[PDB]
Amino acid sequence: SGFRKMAFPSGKVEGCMVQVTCGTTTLNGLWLDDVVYCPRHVICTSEDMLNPNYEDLLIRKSNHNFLVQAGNVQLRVIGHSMQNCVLKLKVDTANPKTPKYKFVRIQPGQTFSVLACYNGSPSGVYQCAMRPNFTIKGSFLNGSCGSVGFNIDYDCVSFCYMHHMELPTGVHAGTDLEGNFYGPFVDRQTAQAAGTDTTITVNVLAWLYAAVINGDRWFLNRFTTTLNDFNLVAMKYNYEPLTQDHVDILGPLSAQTGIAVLDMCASLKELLQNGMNGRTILGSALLEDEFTPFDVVRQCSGVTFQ
Amino acid sequence: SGFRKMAFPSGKVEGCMVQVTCGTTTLNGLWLDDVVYCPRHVICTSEDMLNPNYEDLLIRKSNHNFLVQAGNVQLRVIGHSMQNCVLKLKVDTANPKTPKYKFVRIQPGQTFSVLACYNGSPSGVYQCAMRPNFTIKGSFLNGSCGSVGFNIDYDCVSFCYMHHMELPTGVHAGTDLEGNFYGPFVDRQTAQAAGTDTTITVNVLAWLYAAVINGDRWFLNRFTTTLNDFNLVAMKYNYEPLTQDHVDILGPLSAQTGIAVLDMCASLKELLQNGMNGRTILGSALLEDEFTPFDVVRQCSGVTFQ
Ligand SMILES: *[C@H](O)[C@H](C[C@@H]1CCNC1=O)NC(=O)[C@H](CC(C)(C)C)NC(=O)N1CC[C@@H]1c1ccccc1
Ligand SMILES: *[C@H](O)[C@H](C[C@@H]1CCNC1=O)NC(=O)[C@H](CC(C)(C)C)NC(=O)N1CC[C@@H]1c1ccccc1
């Protein structure tokens, strides 16, 4: 038993991380087969990052302007090109540690693990959610760009995120691995801001189920509610609406605990109207929304990856 | 910026994990050079685990009773012996992925990363603290025994923990890598229980510094306090006493923020007497005590590992 914010094991991704240097800018790259992926702003200087013309800046580079470093070994760049907001650096060596992988784009509400990296060297791993406003609440300092987010499915790594920038409220913005930003952000220095966020209702419910599986039951109640009456309360507290497909996805958790989904909604309603009254749920005094129904089943049943 | 519960990258440890089977018991082992380490209760059956005589049980085994599996490759056991509560299984192949490592025992209050494993296959990674009562609040199911906890120091892996059992309150107990339990627990089925815990005061203070570094300042105050008067309040709220060495260790964080350690103590005192009043600190509505001063500096300054 127990419940923790759990990341995927990171070894398969660690073997792909390299350091990309252009001019006086160094960030991280992701090396798969004979291509290195990295944020395109590696080609900018300090005054470039104001309002750059990336096509203009790239036509003025050649292969030898890109220093790529895989540990203590230099990778020779033999071609380069831009794909939306990422660069693709063709190198003369295929990565022998290339895992089976996919490039997939995720939905707000889904989770993934981040391998934070500096100078091509991994620094730490943690679990993140894509917020409804397409930001993530990460931990990123100077030099961390090019770090990636991923999920693991048996032996296959689904890369979903590449880091690019921090917004004024201290939250983070990036692209999928085809270089397309999550949300309405650009890789320039403008006055861009996050945009109002909501709480991921389906995930809170899944986490309430994790609590029941782990022995926290004090918030359970005999009342029930219709889906419509629950969604009237969710709107009032800035929670996003719950749909019948969310109810269906909570089916397995409902059946393992014997608590009907709409009954758990009634519990959440009371928690929203009364608060917690000095108690905690799974070590938290807030309602947690960064575990999916899948995360709960995975952890509360013991699935591995090979 | 940002602050997250961050684990070390796990790849160096993933390459050491194997599956150890004896009879109908399967758990995890740690394979370094030509030795596999695992919990000694792998040799017990269901009725054995009541009140076993492990020396008796081990003399009745031979090498061929231990099936060791490194992925899809079987490791031949050529010797075995008991070291306190772990078995050492000598195999005919040295692990080619053996990192530089040490076996070190930690203090209550220090942190480490756990690589949770089933059937020799890693499942997830997360950060833990050794509680003052020598338990850890983990996430462990059947089959997870033999999973290890570790820290990384540049390229060297300091193994500090091997998992053995869950206690009645849902918390977890294990040994260091020489097989000696943390705390007053035994590897038998008895009525053993955790024992009353305390809050790790020095870590709460470090986390308050992390908050200030990240822009949460609402809890700061103009008052100060003597160390003695703070420790009178800490005792009342089940916090452990703060020593002059703790103050010294908070020096660097004090100097980066400009907030004297005893001033931050005065802030903690007010937080203990008044609570939070509906506000949060680094996304938490509780005072968090599972980050060390080192964890805060590491994350808020960007140290990597190679
Ligand atoms: C690439 O390593 C960095 C990652 C940033 C640095 C601080 N935290 C991060 O996540 N990305 C940038 O530096 C990015 C460059 C472009 C303007 C070209 C997109 N800029 C920012 O992230 N900026 C400029 C304001 C924000 C920032 C916040 C906090 C500290 C430094 C910068
Ligand atoms: C080795 O894989 C397991 C790990 C346990 C299983 C559930 N959570 C864990 O952390 N260790 C044991 O099964 C251990 C064996 C000895 C008695 C020989 C030490 N026993 C327990 O951990 N037990 C028996 C009560 C507690 C338990 C709690 C919850 C579920 C199952 C067992």
From Swiss-Prot, chains A, B:
Reactions this protein catalyses: TSAVLQ-|-SGFRK-NH2 and SGVTFQ-|-GKFKK the two peptides corresponding to the two self-cleavage sites of the SARS 3C-like proteinase are the two most reactive peptide substrates. The enzyme exhibits a strong preference for substrates containing Gln at P1 position and Leu at P2 position
Residue ranges of domain Peptidase C30 in the record: 1-306
UniProt effect for mutating L205V: In strain: Zeta/P.2
Domain of life of the organism encoding this protein: Viruses
Location of the protein in the cell: Host cytoplasm; Host Golgi apparatus; Host nucleus
Signal peptide: none
Impact upon substituting M49A: Does not affect ability to cleave and inactivate human TRMT1
Summary of subunit composition and partner proteins: 3CL-PRO exists as monomer and homodimer. Only the homodimer shows catalytic activity. Interacts with host FBXO22; this interaction promotes the proteasomal degradation of nsp5.
Protein name: 3C-like proteinase nsp5
Protein source organism: Severe acute respiratory syndrome coronavirus 2
Lineage: Viruses, Riboviria, Orthornavirae, Pisuviricota, Pisoniviricetes
Residues of the full protein shown: 3264 to 3569 of 7096
